[PDB]
Amino acid sequence: MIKIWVHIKNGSIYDITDIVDKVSWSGDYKSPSRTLEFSIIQSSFDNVFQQIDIPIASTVCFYVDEKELFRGMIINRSKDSSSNEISFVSKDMGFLLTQSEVSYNFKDKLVEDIAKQVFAENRLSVGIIAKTNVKYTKMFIGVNGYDTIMSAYTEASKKTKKKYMIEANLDKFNVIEKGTVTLSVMFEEGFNIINTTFSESMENVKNKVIVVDQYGSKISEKIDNEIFKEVNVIMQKVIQQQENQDVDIDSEFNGIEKSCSLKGYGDVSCITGRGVKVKDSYTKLVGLFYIDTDKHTWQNGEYQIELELNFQNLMDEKSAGQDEPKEESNLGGEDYAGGKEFTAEFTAYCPRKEEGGDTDCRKKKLDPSKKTCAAPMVGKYEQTYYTKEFLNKHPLLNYGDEIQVITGVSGRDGVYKVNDVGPAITIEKNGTYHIDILFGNVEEASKFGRRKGKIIIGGYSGNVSDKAKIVISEAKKHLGKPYKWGGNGPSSFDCSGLMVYCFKKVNVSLPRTSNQQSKKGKKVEQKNLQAGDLVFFHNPVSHVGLYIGNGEFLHAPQKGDVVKISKLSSRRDFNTARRVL
Amino acid sequence: MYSDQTYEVIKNRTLENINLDIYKGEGSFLNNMVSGNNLELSKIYLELSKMHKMAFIQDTYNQFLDKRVNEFGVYRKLGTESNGEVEFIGEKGTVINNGTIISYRDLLFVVIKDVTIGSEEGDNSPVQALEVGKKYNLPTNCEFKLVDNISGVTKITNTRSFEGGTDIETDEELKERFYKIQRNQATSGNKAHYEEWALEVDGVYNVKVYPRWDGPGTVKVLIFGKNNQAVDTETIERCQQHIDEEKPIGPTITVVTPLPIEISISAVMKLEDGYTLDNVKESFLESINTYFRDIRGEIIYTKVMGILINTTGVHDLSNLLINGSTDNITINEDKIPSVTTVNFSE
Amino acid sequence: EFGVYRKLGTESNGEVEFIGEKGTVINNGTIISYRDLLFVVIKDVTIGSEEGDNSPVQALEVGKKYNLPT
Amino acid sequence: STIFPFIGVPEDYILPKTEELPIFREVAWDFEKDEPILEKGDFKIIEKKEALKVWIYKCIKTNRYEHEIYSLEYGTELSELIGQKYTKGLTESEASRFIKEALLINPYILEVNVKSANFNRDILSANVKVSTIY
């Protein structure tokens, strides 16, 4: 389903889909505007086949599947007397950039700001502009806006290792980087490919760079070995540096170019500036290509595409870097181990004043939401068979202990704290534990009754990592050492050298300066601070601390002070935290 | 290079070396004679390639790896069978003797001690796995079955989980342990080895060592748990055994745990309206135990009577005595202050 | 096998002098270069300050080539 | 990620692997009782031709569009022939086509042939020959 609408100057709007004979839609990466060509059936000999007229410079809109892809102005119009057809050529809005011609003087400006100013000077709407923190300095005299923006973004690309293009989509202007979007469709030989032609060329190869000063005399030269391995010949290039620029040689080298010319079946998503995937038939290998030129045609009820593709690299089988989703082993309550499992018998508890015992060990009113329970407490109820062997085999619990209770009921299973006091709450001879479950009303207790289950006690590690102990011990080993700026030896440490040494002792390499150290590892919050974390406070990280927990951390304060332990709250200036273990 | 050396290359070179006038090609006499042992040489080259791989220590497979580590003296660790206890339920008087085998699923276990059902010593007897492995660490409430039917026994079950099962140490673990042992340097000289070895044991956070605590040739190590608190007997035993395994000849090692110091607090106070002695007593107990958690070394009298006056519900104070005195209680190492008895009078 | 390890070398260390406008602060981690060699500043230094304009500097790579002269 | 193998592969470059399917394995199933089979207190696993037999039985026994969990490809339309809705020759053609198209979605099955077909009272008989990689 393709629809074409035309807006005429007076205010009339026509739907001309039933008259169109042929449609073509195309673009290239070396021009800022896309083009649309179509024909309609119109006869002057026959009165029946006379149609409306579409004057020059009227807007035409192109829809595919209820989506607008093109909006532009009509530029050419032609009529042949032999054939009953009228031909049109339309252009995108992007050609308005090359009409402008302004003189600028840019000093130490961001490339994005340069593009924004150019778009603002000759009034144009901006959709989105690619971000790059590269500063540029240039003098433009009698140059287009398009050329200005492209030159600035080429200079930015010399650092970002990227490619950029200018796209005018409907009524908006955009600057995007090529290949960021990769299409879902893949071209395979046995499925949707009509024909292909692969080529390789050597003509535009460069493997030597010569730099000359502003006077013509040569200063330095360089050869690229990897390209020279492929081609035995030396093909040199000469560039000139002025006084205020220091050129980078490695950007000027150019290698062998590999391309493909493809014709097949696809969707309207395959346009210039996107990445596509082509599968090799013989080796069953997939390669990634960037689209440079495209053309879509609708005619006689069939739709075909033609692309010019530029090869980037071979897609790695499975995952190249093997990115795994970094997750903790346990979402909550990590390193629970040592939890010996004992069979238990569960009894229901109702809070009644007449019966008594509603007070706990500390004589506070019981709260059903606490999920507290009654288990034997050392010295409360002792029978005759509670021998030392039996006690070591079946250990009695303590007040406030956290035990895992599994009654077999949804909601009645979980960690239970031993706080409630219950008469005749002991352990049988076989080892079954009497655990009294607290309830908030009579009905729930009556429903629960007496059941048999299992409980877990005395299981907990509460550690973070083995290397944390080593690092903490080493940091304590360097306590009281005389301070020295820029010293990283057991004799004296600066603020960052301490953790450099400590984490090097556990094979963890970090930036020498603490400012860069802030830019390593996962972010850590103040409430998520654990032993071994790194804490940074001032906007300049003059001293970084090693967080050991308990609101304390180890560091080298400054010159004149010695390595000691500081309380975290005393440092009101907290900024962020990182973890690298 | 052994890979390129192939039957075709060897044969071609051998034929080129021979200086005869006759025709050398497929189906000739000389070609037939030469071929046959060049194929064998091409066979031999692959074994020659593999030999240097199986020579080293990084990749020695299983048996030759055992020989190399036994040269270094490191032995492969074999598993130990799990240990557990089950209960026998049935008619009174049925006697279950040692060597009796019980079964759960396809695993087999042996009853260690003679046990009689309904006897005074109990119906629980030790259980040992017939084979090593981690798979024998059965959970609780597992119904065991008897291989040979003995009249009078109804049901076998375990009351706790099985523990002690260990698997066979593989090659990678052996190599890692060997590499860490050889890389590690352990001299007897400096005091740091003792604290290091103590720290190698889990459950320990702070370590203090006292040379010649009990005369020459005596060492007393002092381990501390989380927040410098008392460690369990298991961690103490593990630390003792590890330090013994790493200590050199000459010293004796003793490791102990902190002991609470008995503290008695007495005061005369005036309470606010609506507040009794018990509520302020509880609040003071909580605040003072928190302070004792945060305290280091000696106890300070001023903090004590400040925390007594800042309790909710107390209006005025007088005559606070800390263990019968107002002076600071200096606390030795490996000790903590604990409340014993409160004497508060309105 | 015998525990011996090769040594990759130690990075050259030094300190440089910042001459410029007063009030300009050089952030920790600012990168500088000496011909093909490159160096990083180790201290937050501000020009004209009572602390002086000198900041320690460490080479990014090991090698005796980074043992710079005066 | 550097080579360009579309015109030709470099002579030193080694192909990583040849692409083959793993050994087909499936939980064993008994046909006279329509149950999975338990062996030593666990599910018994068979492989290759017997597993393919189990899969074929399950695929034939199900209807095409009846269940929401399945896709539009899985199942068989043989239930539309019951009652002589079509003539006999059209029934034979449709049955052959249905069986072939239903079975050919398994990648381990290479070719299916429905050779014989006979009408006796209310029973239709046929012979199906399945060719696999094994």
DSSP collapsed to 3 states, A22-34: EEEEEEECCCCCC
Looking up tokens 């029978």 gives A383
**At residue A238, what is the residue type?**
V
SS (H, E, C) A502-529: HHHCCCCCCCCCHHHHCCCCEEECCCCC
A569 CA to centre of own chain: 33
Tell me the two tokens of residue B239.
């630390």
Distances (CA, A) of B13 to A471, B5, B35, B125, C70: 62, 10, 12, 78, 63
Query: Given CB atoms, is A550 within the 8 Å cutoff of chain B?
Result: yes
Q: How many helices (H) and strands (E) does chain D have?
A: 2, 6
Give the chain C residue nearest A248 (alpha carbons).
C36
Q: What is the rounded CA–CA span in Å between residue A311 and residue A318?
A: 20
Tell me the two tokens of residue A343.
């069979």
Distances (CA, A) of B117 to A385, B162, D44: 17, 22, 40
The C-alpha of C6 sits at a distance from chain B's nearest C-alpha, in angstroms, of 13
Closest CA to A549 of A567, A524, A536, A562: A567
Compute φ and ψ for B179, nearest 5 degrees: -65, -40
**At residue D55, what is the residue type?**
W
Distances (CA, A) of A328 to A333, A547, B14: 11, 20, 63
Q: What's the Rg (C-alpha) of chain B?
A: 37
A293 CA to centre of own chain: 29
Element (H, E) at C46: strand C45-46
CA atoms within 13 A on the CB side of D126: 18
Do residues B144 and B90 lie in contact, with contact meaning Cβ atoms separated by under 8 Å? no
CA atoms within 13 A on the CB side of A445: 14
Distances (CA, A) of C7 to B189, B281, C4, C38, C60: 26, 65, 10, 22, 17
Q: What is the rounded CA–CA span in Å between residue A560 and residue A543?
A: 14
User: Which residues 6+ apart lie within 8 Å of B346 measured at CB?
Assistant: B269, B270, B271, B277
Q: What is the rounded CA–CA span in Å between residue B105 and residue B101?
A: 13
Determine whether the interchain pair A314/D6 forms a contact, defined as Cβ–Cβ distance below 8 Å. Answer: no
Determine whether the interchain pair C29/A486 forms a contact, defined as Cβ–Cβ distance below 8 Å. Answer: no
Chain D, window 15-74: residues with a beta carbon less than 8 angstroms from a chain A beta carbon = 15-16, 19
Chain A, window 391-420: residues with a beta carbon less than 8 angstroms from a chain B beta carbon = 393
Q: What share of chain D is helix, strand, coil (3-state, %, to 5)?
A: 25, 25, 50
Can you give the resolution of this entry in Å?
2.9
Distances (CA, A) of D70 to A415, A456, D64, D79: 42, 44, 8, 17
Q: What is the rounded CA–CA span in Å between residue B128 and residue B110?
A: 5
Which subunits sit against C, judged by 3+ Cβ pairs under 8 A? Answer: A, B
Give the chain A residue nearest B294 (alpha carbons).
A550
Give the chain B residue nearest A453 (alpha carbons).
B141
Calculate helix-pair angle for B171-183, B63-72, nearest 10 degrees. 20
Q: What is the rounded CA–CA span in Å between residue B32 and residue B46?
A: 24
Give the chain B residue nearest A394 (alpha carbons).
B160
Compute φ and ψ for A107, nearest 5 degrees: -130, 115
Distances (CA, A) of D49 to A215, A231, D32, D57: 82, 55, 19, 12
Q: What angle do CA A350, A354, A358 make, to 5 degrees?
A: 50
Q: What is the rounded CA–CA span in Å between residue A40 and residue A59?
A: 16
Query: Given CB atoms, is C2 within the 8 Å cutoff of chain B?
Result: yes
Beta bridge partners of residue B339, listed in sequence order = B263
The C-alpha of A432 sits at a distance from chain B's nearest C-alpha, in angstroms, of 7
Exposure class string for A542-568: b at 16+ Cβ within 10 A, else e: bbbbbbbbeeebbbbeeeeeebeebeb
Q: What is the rounded CA–CA span in Å between residue C55 and residue A532?
A: 29
Query: Given CB atoms, is B182 within the 8 Å cutoff of chain C?
Result: yes
Q: Does B touch C (3+ CB pairs < 8 Å)?
A: yes
Exposure class string for C31-49: b at 16+ Cβ within 10 A, else e: eeeeeeeebbbbbbbbbee
Determine whether the interchain pair A283/D9 forms a contact, defined as Cβ–Cβ distance below 8 Å. Answer: yes
